[PDB]
Amino acid sequence: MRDFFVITNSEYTFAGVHYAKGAVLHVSPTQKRAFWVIADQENFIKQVNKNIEYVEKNASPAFLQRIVEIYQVKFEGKNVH
Amino acid sequence: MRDFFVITNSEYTFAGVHYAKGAVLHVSPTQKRAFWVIADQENFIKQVNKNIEYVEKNASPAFLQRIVEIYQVKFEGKNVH
Amino acid sequence: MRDFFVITNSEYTFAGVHYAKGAVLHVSPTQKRAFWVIADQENFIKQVNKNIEYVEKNASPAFLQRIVEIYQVKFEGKNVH
Amino acid sequence: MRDFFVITNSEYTFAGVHYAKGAVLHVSPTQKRAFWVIADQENFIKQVNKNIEYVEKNASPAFLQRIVEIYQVKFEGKNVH
Ligand code: NA
Ligand code: NA
Ligand code: NA
Ligand code: NA
Numbered sequence: 001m002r003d004f005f006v007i008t009n010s011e012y013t014f015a016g017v018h019y020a021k022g023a024v025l026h027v028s029p030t031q032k033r034a035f036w037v038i039a040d041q042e043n044f045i046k047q048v049n050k051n052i053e054y055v056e057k058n059a060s061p062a063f064l065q066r067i068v069e070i071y072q073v074k075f076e077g078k079n080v081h
Numbered sequence: 082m083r084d085f086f087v088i089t090n091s092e093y094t095f096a097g098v099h100y101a102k103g104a105v106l107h108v109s110p111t112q113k114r115a116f117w118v119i120a121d122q123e124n125f126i127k128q129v130n131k132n133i134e135y136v137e138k139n140a141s142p143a144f145l146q147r148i149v150e151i152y153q154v155k156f157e158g159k160n161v162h
Numbered sequence: 163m164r165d166f167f168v169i170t171n172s173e174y175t176f177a178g179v180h181y182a183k184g185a186v187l188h189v190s191p192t193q194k195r196a197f198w199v200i201a202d203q204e205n206f207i208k209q210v211n212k213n214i215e216y217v218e219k220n221a222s223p224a225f226l227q228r229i230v231e232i233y234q235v236k237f238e239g240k241n242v243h
Numbered sequence: 244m245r246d247f248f249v250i251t252n253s254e255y256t257f258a259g260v261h262y263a264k265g266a267v268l269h270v271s272p273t274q275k276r277a278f279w280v281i282a283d284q285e286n287f288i289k290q291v292n293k294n295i296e297y298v299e300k301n302a303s304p305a306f307l308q309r310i311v312e313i314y315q316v317k318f319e320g321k322n323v324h
Contacts, residue, residue, distance in 0.1 A: 001084050001109070001130050003244050028244070030111050030192070030273050031315065044309045048298045049244050055129045066125045069160055072112065079312055082165050082190070082211050111192050111273070136210045147206045150241055153193065163246050163271070163292050192273050217291045228287045231322055234274065 001029040001071060003049060005042070009058035015068070015075040025059070029071040034064075036078045082110040082152060084130060086123070090139035096149070096156040106140070110152040115145075117159045163191040163233060165211060167204070171220035177230070177237040187221070191233040196226075198240045244272040244314060246292060248285070252301035258311070258318040268302070272314040277307075279321045 008023040017036070019025070024042050027034040037045065045052060056063055067073050089104040098117070100106070105123050108115040118126065126133060137144055148154050170185040179198070181187070186204050189196040199207065207214060218225055229235050251266040260279070262268070267285050270277040280288065288295060299306055310316050 001111075004129055026313065028272075028314075029109075030244075031275075032112075033315070037313075041309065041313060044306075045313060048247055048310075063125075066122065067129075070107065070118075070122060070126060071109075072114070082192075085210055110190075113193075144206075147203065148210075151188065151199075151203060151207060152190075153195070163273075166291055191271075194274075225287075228284065229291075232269065232280075232284060232288060233271075234276070 003028045003030070003045075003052055005045075005052060005054045006059040006063065006067075007054060007057040009060050012061055014061050014064045017075050017077045019077075025064075025075075027067060027071070027073060029073065032072050032074055033076065034067065034073045035076040038078060038080055041080070084109045084111070084126075084133055086126075086133060086135045087140040087144065087148075088135060088138040090141050093142055095142050095145045098156050098158045100158075106145075106156075108148060108152070108154060110154065113153050113155055114157065115148065115154045116157040119159060119161055122161070165190045165192070165207075165214055167207075167214060167216045168221040168225065168229075169216060169219040171222050174223055176223050176226045179237050179239045181239075187226075187237075189229060189233070189235060191235065194234050194236055195238065196229065196235045197238040200240060200242055203242070246271045246273070246288075246295055248288075248295060248297045249302040249306065249310075250297060250300040252303050255304055257304050257307045260318050260320045262320075268307075268318075270310060270314070270316060272316065275315050275317055276319065277310065277316045278319040281321060281323055284323070 006025050008019045011021045023036045026037045087106050089100045092102045104117045106115050107118045168187050170181045173183045185198045188199045249268050251262045254264045266279045268277050269280045
């Protein structure tokens with residue numbers, strides 16, 4: 001599966017990672033990695049991968065759990081300030 | 082190769098895994114993994130990967146063996162109830 | 163890079179593998195694997211990956227070496243009779 | 244993410260690798276690898292991957308650092324003369 005974005009529907013911890021409400025998560029099934037991007041990173045991604053989709057803008061913990069089940073993704077927090 | 086679905090043509094064990102007739106298998110060549118999805122998972126996949134194809138709806142064990150040969154996929158059963 | 167086919171331009175050994183002239187090689191950069199497919203496998207691939215391209219139908223050893231350089235692919239022979 | 248090209252905006256060392264100004268870097272998120280291609284390799288890539296994009300033709304070190312952050316890519320120099 002291509003990379004995609006989701007946006008958290010509320011503030012929660014999923015897979016040990018705290019996410020604010022409205023956190024944009026970049027999900028990469030090929031790399032088995034999802035992480036919370038800052039705005040500049042979100043925008044960068046859309047330069048290099050212009051057709052990336054926001055497939056769910058109200059992602060609950062149950063939605064993220066489906067990503068774990070289907071794509072075996074390891075969720076992470078931010079990797080920059 | 083992109084991810085794709087197949088549907089089993091009959092009830093059988095393939096690669097040590099029991100599949101009912103009509104089992105929808107999500108096949109991911111990139112992750113070298115195929116597994117039997119439940120309906121809610123099948124539907125989830127079509128939200129995040131809207132263009133996924135059902136490339137064979139009468140997949141026999143011989144068809145799954147081609148998937149092993151070409152894509153080196155490890156077949157699994159369900160991962161939820 | 164997506165998977166693609168090449169066809170050998172002559173009979174040769176490349177990366178320790180013998181290929182007949184006209185051997186169809188399935189190349190998978192994501193899996194770092196290329197191998198010589200039999201006709202039934204070639205046809206199977208076109209069912210599950212209908213848009214796969216034959217990007218070079220006169221591939222010399224030098225062409226395969228570019229595949230090694232760019233995609234780090236391990237070349238193999240047939241995996242069925 | 245699909246493979247893509249960038250072109251360096253100036254001469255610099257990034258991740259321990261020297262790049263001339265105007266160096267074309269082939270970036271493969273799936274393989275977590277980017278490297279400086281020679282012209283013949285650049286052209287080869289466009290034969291096998293005809294739709295590859297030059298997503299940034301003035302890539303600074305900060306741009307390459309985003310590639311590291313988002314795609315976990317290991318940068319390399321040339322692999323041929
Ligand atoms: Na946004
Ligand atoms: Na179905
Ligand atoms: Na042919
Ligand atoms: Na150029």
